[PDB]
Design a protein around this ligand. Structure first.
Ligand SMILES: *[C@@H]1O[C@H](CO)[C@@H](O[C@@H]2O[C@H](CO)[C@@H](O[C@@H]3O[C@H](CO)[C@@H](O)[C@H](O)[C@@H]3O)[C@H](O)[C@H]2NC(C)=O)[C@H](O)[C@H]1NC(C)=O
Ligand SMILES: *[C@@H]1O[C@H](CO)[C@@H](O[C@@H]2O[C@H](CO)[C@@H](O[C@@H]3O[C@H](CO)[C@@H](O)[C@H](O)[C@@H]3O)[C@H](O)[C@H]2NC(C)=O)[C@H](O)[C@H]1NC(C)=O
Lengths: 51, 50
């Protein structure tokens, strides 16, 4: 869970096979969060976070 | 100028806070309008929401 005082993003990792690229069949989904001045970014995770 | 088009001043409320009914925005309840004018001073006083 990536959250800001204005908005909140939350993603669940979806396990499964993907066609291997560079011998790596796993994948990574990348997201972004912009934090305006006077706001605070906070991250809540229990797993699979590449902070 | 208000006369030709029905103006509704948002004051301390956004259009959404009035739609949801932030208690400070109870005055706008059931109010129709031709033009809503959201203010920059407007804040939200109730439960955090996106
Ligand atoms: C589900 O199906 C996918 C798609 O076939 C499987 O991924 C593939 O697994 C095989 C395992 O033998 C990979 O073969 C490897 O090829 C490299 C090429 O250099 C070789 O060095 C290894 O010794 C091995 O033979 C294959 O690359 C891989 N990907 C693809 C696109 O075929 C997957 O294993 C299956 N099972 C599961 C549980 O996902
Ligand atoms: C819209 O929002 C603004 C800002 O939140 C409101 O102005 C504020 O109004 C409150 C009372 O409604 C004022 O509190 C009182 O102010 C007087 C004078 O300073 C003081 O004697 C009292 O002890 C109390 O603090 C507050 O000062 C005032 N803010 C400013 C910057 O003047 C406005 O009333 C709201 N209007 C509606 C319709 O919601």
């Amino acid at each position: 869970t990536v959250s800001t005082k204005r908005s909140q993003q939350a993603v669940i990792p979806n396990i499964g096979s993907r066609p291997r690229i560079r011998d790596i069949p796993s994948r990574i989904s990348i997201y972004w969060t912009i934090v305006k001045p006077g706001d605070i970014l906070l991250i809540n995770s229990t797993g699979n976070l590449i902070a | 100028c208000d006369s030709p088009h029905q103006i509704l001043d948002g004051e301390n409320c956004t259009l959404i806070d009035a739609l949801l009914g932030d208690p400070q925005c109870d005055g706008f309840q059931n109010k129709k309008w031709d033009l809503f004018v959201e203010r920059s001073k407007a804040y939200s006083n109730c439960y955090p929401y996106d």
